[PDB]
Amino acid sequence: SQIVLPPHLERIREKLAENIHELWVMNKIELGWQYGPVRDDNKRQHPCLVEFSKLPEQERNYNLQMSLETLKTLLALGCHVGISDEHAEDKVKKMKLPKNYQLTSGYKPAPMDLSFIKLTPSQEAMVDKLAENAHNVWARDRIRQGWTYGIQQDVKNRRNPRLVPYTLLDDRTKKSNKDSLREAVRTLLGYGYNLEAPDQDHAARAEVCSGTGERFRIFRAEKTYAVKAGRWYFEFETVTAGDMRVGWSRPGCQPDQELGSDERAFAFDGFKAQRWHQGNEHYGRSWQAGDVVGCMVDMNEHTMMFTLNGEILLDDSGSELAFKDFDVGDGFIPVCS
Ligand SMILES: Nc1ncnc2c1ncn2[C@@H]1O[C@H](COP(=O)(O)OP(=O)(O)OP(=O)(O)O)[C@@H](O)[C@H]1O
């Protein structure tokens, strides 16, 4: 609603609405439909196969309003308005079609040949978001009318399986309406308004939010199994690749504090390839999904070692010791975050 259509976009909008409805009234005929009084699916009949004047005025209103909303959404996402050339837009191309698959109306079959334009993937992704917004509008209309999602289609319960998120949406109807709207956008560019796609947002939020507030869960062995001396080994297999920390923790480790931030835990962050004790320092390489990290501690000379799929991880220098010297204290127990 906040979008104000400039006058050039307005008088282009009128005849692009005309162009789209006539595109539709031969796409139905090439699908094989035929003109008729009532909108019957089995009879293969619709009054809309004819010019907009004799076409039902309510369907004309729908077509014009959806074209206006399409252009308004394109402007609302920030698509740069494109002008090819005034005489290029004044020039109109006609490509004749066979009568059986040609519209009953007198409009030109192909104002623009779908071939001679190489459509840039930037505005192709723009057409993607346009389809997503259009289906959002449709679903909003259904909710306003009171329709709700139901796996089996039922009109009397107003239950529709189509009411689903766009990514989860049915592939067949998805590609159908989606290619209809891609060819509509293709036509509006080919007519002369070669709209320039806006910038692509490379930055991603990466979905760091979690259920509830807690960001990590710490798993550790019992405090009674603390080792005071000797050589010990355990393995940590990363089913997924991501934010994990594994190592040895003191029996006083706090569940709410991240491993290695404090002084009471020694951890290895393979996701950042970084060690953790009273802070973080670069250590080793990163793991992939399915990698196994071996944790080796020798409590006699107070050293810790780490392995990634067998090979011993090493510092920025050639040293293989993850941590050089630490007091035995009250022992260490295996831990993972
Ligand atoms: N060529 C077209 N391209 C896109 N949308 C169109 C086109 N022609 C018509 N429409 C829209 O499709 C709508 C179809 O409405 P229809 O009567 O089929 O469904 P409905 O009344 O919501 O029924 P129900 O959802 O219960 O099946 C029309 O009202 C119009 O807004």
Ligand SMILES: COc1ccc2c(c1)CN(Cc1ccc(C(=O)O)cc1)CCS2
């Ligand atoms: C996708 O454009 C079209 C193509 C063909 C037809 C219509 C719309 C109009 N229809 C009503 C209709 C419209 C849209 C939907 C929908 O997909 O939500 C369902 C029914 C009657 C049969 S002719």
